Amino acid sequence: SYTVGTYLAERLVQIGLKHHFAVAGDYNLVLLDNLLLNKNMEQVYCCNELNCGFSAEGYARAKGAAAAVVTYSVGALSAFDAIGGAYAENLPVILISGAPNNNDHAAGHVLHHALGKTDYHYQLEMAKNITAAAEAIYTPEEAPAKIDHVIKTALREKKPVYLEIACNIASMPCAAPGPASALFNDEASDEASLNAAVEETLKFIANRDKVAVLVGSKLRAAGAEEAAVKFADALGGAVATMAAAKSFFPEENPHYIGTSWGEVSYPGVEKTMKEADAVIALAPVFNDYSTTGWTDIPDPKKLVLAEPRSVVVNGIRFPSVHLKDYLTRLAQKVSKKTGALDFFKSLNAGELKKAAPADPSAPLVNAEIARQVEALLTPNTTVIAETGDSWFNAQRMKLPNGARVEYEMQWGHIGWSVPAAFGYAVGAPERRNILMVGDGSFQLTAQEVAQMVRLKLPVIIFLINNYGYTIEVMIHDGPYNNIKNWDYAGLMEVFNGNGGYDSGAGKGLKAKTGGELAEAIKVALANTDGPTLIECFIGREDCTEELVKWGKRVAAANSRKPVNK
Amino acid sequence: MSYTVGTYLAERLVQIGLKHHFAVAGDYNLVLLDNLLLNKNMEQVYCCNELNCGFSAEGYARAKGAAAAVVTYSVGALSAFDAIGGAYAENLPVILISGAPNNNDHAAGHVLHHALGKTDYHYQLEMAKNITAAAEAIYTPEEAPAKIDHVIKTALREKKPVYLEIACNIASMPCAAPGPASALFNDEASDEASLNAAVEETLKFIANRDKVAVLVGSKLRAAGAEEAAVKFADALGGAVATMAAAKSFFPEENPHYIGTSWGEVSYPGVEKTMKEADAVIALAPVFNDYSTTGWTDIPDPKKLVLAEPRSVVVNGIRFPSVHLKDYLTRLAQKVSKKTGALDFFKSLNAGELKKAAPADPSAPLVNAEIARQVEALLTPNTTVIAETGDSWFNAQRMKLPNGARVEYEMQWGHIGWSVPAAFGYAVGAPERRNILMVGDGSFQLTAQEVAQMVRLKLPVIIFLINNYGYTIEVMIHDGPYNNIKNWDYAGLMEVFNGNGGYDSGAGKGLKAKTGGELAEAIKVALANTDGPTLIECFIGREDCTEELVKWGKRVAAANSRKPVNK
Amino acid sequence: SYTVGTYLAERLVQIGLKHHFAVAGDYNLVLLDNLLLNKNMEQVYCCNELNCGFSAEGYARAKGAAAAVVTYSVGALSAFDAIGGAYAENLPVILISGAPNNNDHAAGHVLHHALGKTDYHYQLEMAKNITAAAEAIYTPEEAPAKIDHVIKTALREKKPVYLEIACNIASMPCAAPGPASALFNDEASDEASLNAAVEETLKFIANRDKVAVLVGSKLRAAGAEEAAVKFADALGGAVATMAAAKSFFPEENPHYIGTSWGEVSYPGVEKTMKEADAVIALAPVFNDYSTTGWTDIPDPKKLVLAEPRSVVVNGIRFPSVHLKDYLTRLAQKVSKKTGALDFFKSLNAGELKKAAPADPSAPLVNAEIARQVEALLTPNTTVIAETGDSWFNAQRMKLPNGARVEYEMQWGHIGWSVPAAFGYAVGAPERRNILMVGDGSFQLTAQEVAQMVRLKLPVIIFLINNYGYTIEVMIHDGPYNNIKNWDYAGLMEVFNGNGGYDSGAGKGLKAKTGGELAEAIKVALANTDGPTLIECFIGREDCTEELVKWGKRVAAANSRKPVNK
Ligand SMILES: Cc1ncc(Cn2nnc(CCOP(=O)(O)OP(=O)(O)O)c2C)c(N)n1
Ligand SMILES: Cc1ncc(Cn2nnc(CCOP(=O)(O)OP(=O)(O)O)c2C)c(N)n1
Ligand SMILES: Cc1ncc(Cn2nnc(CCOP(=O)(O)OP(=O)(O)O)c2C)c(N)n1
Ligand SMILES: [Mg+2]
Ligand SMILES: [Mg+2]
Ligand SMILES: [Mg+2]
């Protein structure tokens, strides 16, 4: 039979979780005990609650969903930052918080970890701002319905949800869970709408021969990556990805022309998009970053807007049309529109100019790091790319089909990459997992590397030590862009703690030349027992051309005077 | 000199006594930070992450009375909210300022970086309202002066944190100039008739109750009533005990001080004395599940005089608008001697708190030996920051020379608070001997802020208690979740130093596995005036205070009590 | 082509609305103009915004959904009371509010109708507490998605939603609406769950022969009224309705045993429910009123809980199982369980004792009113029954199959009945519409009768004038239960205003004896041009036995001392 806690544990197992992440607190200890009863998933502990949230977020990138368990208030509030992030990045992360004994409500009790007033409804209220569903469970009888509701909602909407459970009901009996299939049950496309949206799209492109396809960062959330390839092959048009959609489309596909990112697009792409008679945008997010400071906004008159659950085409909005069904059906009826792809080729714009192997003993430069990392990419690889110049370095890399890039470009919380890489590596241990993180970002969440050591995960970490916040320097410079340098490589033996209570097998290495980097990378690949951090030394100014160009536009957008009135 | 939204804020902060403000840069606040840097009367101090930034400000407020933290929209503010809730719980006026979207982006259908991906940016304000005494968003320059003044006045009056957000494009725009600083501290005075009636009712109440005990609460400092409490205690000549979270809010060398009142983990004799008292005068107390030892130690309502910072309940009458400082002062002038409870305490011959004697220097280090050596470091110029964990209980057992301070975060109780709080405190009180007692588990949440101690060359002495896990949690309810990955904590110091890298540092990391190693480590720490010293102390998990074990069982029982029926 | 306003108007027409309700205000005047452009529905004006909301609420009871349009703040806030009520009663009412010019946001402007601060986000925030979805529209481009989202949500959840529209965008162009079918698109039951829920139900009742069916007040929201009859006929068990579900099951059906309402149940019903081995509850709401002050709570060990979208049976919870599918599938596989019905019959408990025709010239008594109203019931009739003794009078009435009763027993806002009867009558003009309202309730919303006169609706109103709040008196008595008496009958010629600017055809009559009532009823039926108010005079103490019994239990529940921490 089930308890509130084991009911939750089963539902989490049913949606495919093999792990959940946690930080203990007296308001959740019994809950954690009940979760441990289900042997079909492991309980993974984190350093702090912000990292715990981001670890779950990374896990969701690998496995589709995730769960984080924290304690009331002191745990939940910081975790909310990671949950907001999961919301921004369309990931079904389930945050569960311990909560006060249910006897303490409406009793005039001040409790530890709370604000010092006698009510405990505020945490729930805060959570409602950053989740698709949020439920508080005060009695065992209520648990099943509330658990099922937030989980179904998380899976359907691809957004995080919130649960809190009174600490004294976690072991109390409740109903048992029905079949897992109930949790994935979703509406199908409305047939009449699906067909009308496809027909209207055909009418729209009837006499527009240069059709371009723009791949957006919600393509995965729509589960429409495979259908986009089918559509692209049938169309035979030009396909470009928005920056945050890197790896959401096969880069070896003959129709792929590279990154569309305004004035920092791949060669030829910017012109091709400008020349296109029609742009079919697949689940895009157009924000101030992705439009390069509002300088690159798609022409409304040329745009077919295909969202995950609706299509706007030919001046008509079609709700209840799922992107996957739309792309698949379209691929069956659409005819060849090679116009934009032919135009692209006729530009002879060339490939992205990349640097050649540097002199091994020469001082390390940014391009040389990017080159060697790119040469590590296999169809089995995932690159977690942190906010900072790593965004742009990663964007310039050619991906073998199957290789993945993970970006957090909507939330853009520096430090995300470290615990996300941990969570991801736990969820996809079979992959070659690479983390590209700047020194500034690493300092926010560095400790979670110790958990990589703990669980013996072979994450390869490229710590770019350019002594400060370079992306920030390229937006607007000041003393606040300077940081205290660490001996990052030396941090590894600290987290190992060899000769202490336990042990570890992480490695820390320094790379000041191309040759040192190459040797470091060999050591990293041979290290199967723990993470390897490679501390790369480059100058602050030594960054991509793209960052500098993009940075100026971003700063301009941010600072534009107020308009009148 | 004319003002901008940014320099108006900077001046107000300087006017309330800030010599520093804490920040983490983000594109939504870069220009704001530039404007704050224009005022040379305070420094801009940078933090590793926003949670640490908030707790650094929180620690600074403990040293200087108020503080400010500046973060970026959404990704910065949300984690900082945890520290701001903490400031609320601990009654500290921390001002959180967040950068915000360009004011052209509102009601425009724009998706912005760092936000949820909808086109609305009101949610952060809404969340902030839950954990502050005031929260204001500034979208135009004209609105800035009123909203800045309002949240600052509120923070200072209520002794609670407040929230401001400023559109990133208005930080340099002109606005009115600030008037006199005195306007910011302007508060109502006690209502005279009420003040007198509360004092007279108190005298009537204790007329035929000779055993009067004074219970010092953790809001005594927030009420600014520490000094007046001593005056009242000396006039009364009764027994004075402090609640756990009030440690150091009353002079421990005062002849009336009988020690800690904390239920079954009170100092010897104190529990009985409080039970026997005919009247208990509670000065600004917080009675919660922790401070009542799992609801086992609750003051007798029929014996209680409840003197809160701004009201008094006495003799079955509530008197609002009576400030604790005035009440204590007015009372010290009229009250007569009530030595009953103090005489009773002495007659118990309950003795002093039994403390261990100097251990054999080469013998394996034990918890009591650490506590002994730390206690021997206490001077009238010392402050101990004591982390949630057994360090609560070790610190509680220490005798304080008059003037020595202990800082507790026992209401919020966010493990890891101690590290950035000690940083912020040390920035605000560099003249003091600053000691940090933090467990290994807590240290891992916020460890990086030690790098900022190294950066600003702050001589904080850190006792890292390495008992390999969450011992306080183990003593509440044990499971695999209480185990952590051990670090080489001492070695973390040379990492944050980064000597031979881009800059340098003068922190020191040392290990102590015996009393003798600890003693030598402490010498090195005191001689290190150029950076923090972390002393990694090795003890066993079960090697903790008796008090923690007793208190832990009661807490677990309270937490787990079955539901009652409608 | 469409504007923000005409897009909304079309969506409303697409979901079946033939009317929408409004109160003009400068923030919504242009919006109202755009709604008037769609000739497929009428714009109906109300006296005040509270009545406007309840009119829409009553319309939803007739047509399945409804819409109310009000002005910013001064209009919306009172209307929120009616929207909360629609939420409590599971009705898809769409509230649309005018809002400030979109130039006034983040501008430091104080605006008329607002709080006097410079921000206008508070109304939206308040609305979120009482709706299933709430969206503010500040630009035309955003309108289509936000409109579609709240309407789909209202229809799926059967809950009200909220929209606000900047006053200056109502005429601005936006995309056009796709097919209406997209708005009704909903997930189907999860097959595995549906089958498992049915099989578990069969196992549960395998060796429990006395099976009783308890019909709940969410049966209509689940669209499962018809399927419940099919299941009941197959089962051949005893069927009782909870008070608020009156008319949600055919009372001429051989299996119907009457009202189950604790100690105020129909004769024999209370015992039958106590004796049942299994109780199958179809979409019930168990609250402090419906359990008669927590005195009548179903035995958890006997209960099969069939909610609109889930089933809890045999200690297992099955989400994603729609009540309609569950009942239908169940009716195909279940075998005869006549146990509880046989037991009921064997009680020889008799019919509900009703009074016989009173002496026509004798002073009017409550029972005589109830008798004559009951005799007016036809398969084409709807009785709107107000909170008060009218609840209990209506509950005692035998319904010909097809006759409807409308209750607001969850919200229970006195005065709801008057504007609800207006809205209902507008939506179902073909029915004989009867309103049973007490004098105290009538005073809250009396003016909406003028709108019945205005639109020439033949609503028959029984105004029960017992000079005060009798239901309240029977709960707990005090001076606050006394009201100022009106000449209610005379109110009709006031609303007619004959000899003034316009005219009216309402009638007001008094009934102080059975004979006067009978004659009054004849005049009411012959009056096809306007409402007829029949003012019935009875004593304060002359109420149903049920109200007195139920009232005591309710008072006891309300006043029970606090249990200790
Ligand atoms: C939680 C949070 N706080 C601040 C920011 C603003 N921000 N964005 N990028 C940065 C600096 C980037 O630092 P690094 O990791 O060293 O990147 P690079 O120097 O460009 O290789 C900041 C401070 C942010 N995006 N998220
Ligand atoms: C942010 C936050 N997360 C979790 C908790 C719960 N908690 N309280 N105390 C602990 C364990 C602390 O262990 P240490 O710091 O090593 O101290 P010791 O008791 O001396 O072992 C936890 C995990 C908390 N109080 N705050
Ligand atoms: C808006 C609102 N305000 C107050 C109430 C409380 N209330 N509930 N029933 C009543 C009295 C009912 O008055 P009447 O219509 O005369 O009903 P009867 O006299 O029992 O036929 C009150 C005053 C309520 N249910 N709703
Ligand atoms: Mg850097
Ligand atoms: Mg420890
Ligand atoms: Mg009445």
Contact in structure between B53 and B24 (CB atoms under 8 Å): yes
What are φ and ψ of residue B34, in 5° steps? -55, -45
* Closest chain C residue by Cα to residue A105: C565
Torsion sign, CA atoms A219, A225, A227, A231: positive
CATH superfamily of A1-185: Thiamin diphosphate (ThDP)-binding fold, Pyr/PP domains (3.40.50.970)
Look at B117 and A88 and tell me if their CB atoms are within 8 Å: yes
List, in sequence order, the alpha helices (H) in A488-538: 491-496, 514-526
What are φ and ψ of residue C310, in 5° steps? -155, 165
Helix (H) or strand (E) run with residue A532 in it: strand A532-537
- Find residues 442-461 of chain B whose CB sits inside 8 Å of chain C: none
What are φ and ψ of residue B418, in 5° steps? -55, -35
The pick from C441, C462, C558 for probing ligand 3's pocket by mutation, whose C-beta has the most ligand atoms within 8 angstroms, reads: C441
Measure the CA–CA gap between C59 and C160, rounded to whole angstroms.
Answer: 13
What are φ and ψ of residue A48, in 5° steps? -135, 175
Ligand 5 centroid vs B482 CA: distance in angstroms? Answer: 9
Burial (CB count <10 Å: 0-12, 13-18, 19+), residue C147: buried
Measure the CA–CA gap between C164 and B503, rounded to whole angstroms.
Answer: 56
What are φ and ψ of residue B535, in 5° steps? -110, 105
Helix (H) or strand (E) run with residue A462 in it: strand A460-465
Torsion sign, CA atoms B359, B361, B367, B371: positive
Measure the CA–CA gap between C310 and C290, rounded to whole angstroms.
Answer: 21
Amino acid symbol at C76:
A
Nearest to C459 by CA among C496, C490, C423: C423
- Count CA atoms within 13 Å of residue A132 on its CB side: 23
Measure the CA–CA gap between B394 and B260, rounded to whole angstroms.
Answer: 13
Q: Concatenate the DSSP letters of all residues of B103-123 into one string.
A: GGGTTTT-B-TTS-SSS---H
What are φ and ψ of residue A173, in 5° steps? -70, 145
Look at A504 and B485 and tell me if their CB atoms are within 8 Å: yes
Residues in chain B: 566
Measure the CA–CA gap between C355 and C369, rounded to whole angstroms.
Answer: 11
* Closest chain A residue by Cα to residue B100: A558
Measure the CA–CA gap between A70 and A53, rounded to whole angstroms.
Answer: 9
Measure the CA–CA gap between A45 and A93, rounded to whole angstroms.
Answer: 16
Q: Does A209 contact ligand 1 (Cβ within 6 A)?
A: no
List, in order, residues 6 or more apart from A319 with CB less than 8 Å away: A190, A193, A309, A310, C145, C148, C149, C152, C178, C182, C183
The data reach a resolution, in angstroms, of: 2.2
Query: What distance separates the 2 farthest-apart alpha carbons in chain C?
Result: 76
List, in sequence order, the alpha helices (H) in C37-118: 49-63, 76-88
Torsion sign, CA atoms A407, A410, A412, A416: negative
The pick from C393, C472, C480, C542 for probing ligand 3's pocket by mutation, whose C-beta has the most ligand atoms within 8 angstroms, reads: C472
Amino acid symbol at C145:
A
Nearest to A264 by CA among A559, A560, A556, A553: A553
Helices and strands, counts by H and E, chain C: 21, 22
N-to-C CA span, chain B: 66
Measure the CA–CA gap between C431 and C28, rounded to whole angstroms.
Answer: 33
Residues in chain C: 565
3-state helix/strand/coil string of C294-324 = CCCCCCHHHEEEECCCEEEECCEEEECCCHH
- Find residues 111-140 of chain A whose CB sits inside 8 Å of chain B: 111-116, 122, 125-126, 129-130, 139
Amino acid symbol at C8:
L
Nearest to C487 by CA among C416, C415, C439: C439
Give me B291's structure tokens: 């401070």
Q: What is the CATH number of domain C187-349?
A: 3.40.50.1220
Measure the CA–CA gap between A313 and C434, rounded to whole angstroms.
Answer: 49
Measure the CA–CA gap between B394 and B374, rounded to whole angstroms.
Answer: 9
A289: left (phi over 0), alpha (psi -120 to 50) or beta: alpha
Nearest to A452 by CA among A491, A487, A486, A499: A491
- CA distances C284 to A89, A527, B458, C221, C287, Å, are 39, 61, 66, 11, 9
> A188-192 long-range CB contacts below 8 Å, 24 or more apart?
A188/A322, A188/A325, A188/C185, A188/C187, A188/C188, A189/A320, A189/A321, A189/A322, A189/A325, A189/A326, A189/C185, A190/A319, A190/A320, A190/A321, A190/C179, A190/C181, A190/C182, A190/C185, A191/C181, A192/C179, A192/C181, A192/C182
Helix (H) or strand (E) run with residue C240 in it: strand C238-242
Torsion sign, CA atoms B144, B148, B151, B154: negative
Measure the CA–CA gap between C69 and B500, rounded to whole angstroms.
Answer: 71
B40, B46, B50, B53 alpha-carbon torsion, rounded to 10°: -70
Measure the CA–CA gap between B36 and B41, rounded to whole angstroms.
Answer: 10
Residues of chain B with CATH 3.40.50.1220: 188-350
Amino acid symbol at B316:
G
Residues A194-205, buried b or exposed e (16+ Cβ, 10 A)? bbbbbebbeebb
Torsion sign, CA atoms B221, B226, B228, B233: positive
Contact in structure between C399 and C373 (CB atoms under 8 Å): no
* Closest chain C residue by Cα to residue B101: C106
Measure the CA–CA gap between C337 and C130, rounded to whole angstroms.
Answer: 42
List, in sequence order, the alpha helices (H) in C105-263: 122-128, 143-157, 181-184, 191-205, 225-235
Q: What is the CATH number of domain B355-548?
A: 3.40.50.970
> Strands B304-307, B311-314: parallel, antiparallel or unpaired by DSSP?
antiparallel
> Which residues of chain A neighbour C191 with C-beta distances below 8 Å?
181
Contact in structure between A288 and A554 (CB atoms under 8 Å): yes
Torsion sign, CA atoms B536, B541, B542, B545: positive
N-to-C CA span, chain A: 64
Those chains having 3 or more beta-carbon pairs within 8 angstroms of chain A are B, C
Give the closest of B106, B126, B564 to C105, CB-based: B106
List, in order, residues 6 or more apart from A564 with CB less than 8 Å away: none
Q: How many CB atoms lie within 10 A of CB A260?
A: 28
Q: What is the CATH number of domain B1-186?
A: 3.40.50.970
- CA distances A127 to A57, A121, A124, A136, Å, are 16, 10, 5, 10
Q: Concatenate the DSSP letters of all residues of A279-340 into one string.
A: EEEES---BTTTTTTTT----GGGEEEE-SSEEEETTEEEES--HHHHHHHHHHHPPP--HH
Helix (H) or strand (E) run with residue A435 in it: strand A432-438
Angle, helix C49-63 to helix C417-427, in steps of 10 degrees? 50
Give me B534's structure tokens: 């972390």
**Mutant choice from A480, A483, A491, A561 vs B, greatest count of B C-beta within 10 A:** A480
What are φ and ψ of residue C116, in 5° steps? 100, 0
A-B contacts at Cβ under 8 angstroms: 298
- Find residues 271-300 of chain A whose CB sits inside 8 Å of chain B: 285-289
Nearest to C10 by CA among C134, C138, C144: C144
Measure the CA–CA gap between C114 and C124, rounded to whole angstroms.
Answer: 13
Residues of chain C with CATH 3.40.50.970: 1-185, 354-547
3-class SS of residue A89: coil
What are φ and ψ of residue A510, in 5° steps? -110, 145
Measure the CA–CA gap between B537 and C356, rounded to whole angstroms.
Answer: 93
Measure the CA–CA gap between B406 and A552, rounded to whole angstroms.
Answer: 49
Give me A302's structure tokens: 């040329």
Look at C190 and A181 and tell me if their CB atoms are within 8 Å: yes
Burial (CB count <10 Å: 0-12, 13-18, 19+), residue A281: buried
Q: How many CB atoms lie within 10 A of CB C286?
A: 16
Residues of chain A with CATH 3.40.50.1220: 187-349
> Strands B317-320, B311-314: parallel, antiparallel or unpaired by DSSP?
antiparallel
Residue positions forming the annotated binding site of C for thiamine diphosphate: 49
B21, B27, B32, B37 alpha-carbon torsion, rounded to 10°: 60
Give me B120's structure tokens: 């609305």
What are φ and ψ of residue B499, in 5° steps? -60, 135
Domain covering B188-350: architecture: 3-Layer(aba) Sandwich (3.40)
Give me A348's structure tokens: 């002879």
Contact in structure between C496 and C505 (CB atoms under 8 Å): yes
List, in order, residues 6 or more apart from C284 with CB less than 8 Å away: C214, C216, C217, C218, C242, C245, C290, C305
> Which residues of chain B neighbour C564 with C-beta distances below 8 Å?
564
Domain covering C354-547: architecture: 3-Layer(aba) Sandwich (3.40)
Nearest to B100 by CA among B80, B130, B126, B77: B77
Q: How many CB atoms lie within 10 A of CB C203?
A: 11
Q: How many CB atoms lie within 10 A of CB B125?
A: 20
Nearest to B76 by CA among A81, C437, A380, C262: A81
What are φ and ψ of residue A64, in 5° steps? 105, -30
- Count CA atoms within 13 Å of residue C105 on its CB side: 25
Q: How many CB atoms lie within 10 A of CB B383?
A: 23
Give me C472's structure tokens: 């309240």
Give the closest of A186, A196, A319 to C187, CB-based: A186
Helix (H) or strand (E) run with residue C94 in it: strand C93-99
**Solved with:** X-ray
The 8-class DSSP code of residue A261 comes to: -
3-class SS of residue A37: coil
Amino acid symbol at A552:
K
* Closest chain C residue by Cα to residue A180: C193
> Which residues of chain A neighbour B468 with C-beta distances below 8 Å?
501
Measure the CA–CA gap between C98 and C170, rounded to whole angstroms.
Answer: 9
Burial (CB count <10 Å: 0-12, 13-18, 19+), residue C308: buried
Give me A373's structure tokens: 């990392």
Helix (H) or strand (E) run with residue C69 in it: strand C66-70
Place of tokens 């296999």: A378
Radius of gyration of chain B (CA): 25
- Count CA atoms within 13 Å of residue B151 on its CB side: 27
Measure the CA–CA gap between C59 and C88, rounded to whole angstroms.
Answer: 16
A26 CA: nearest ligand 2 atom: 6
N-to-C CA span, chain C: 63
Residues A404-431, buried b or exposed e (16+ Cβ, 10 A)? bbbbbbbbbbbbbbbbbbbbbbbbbeeb
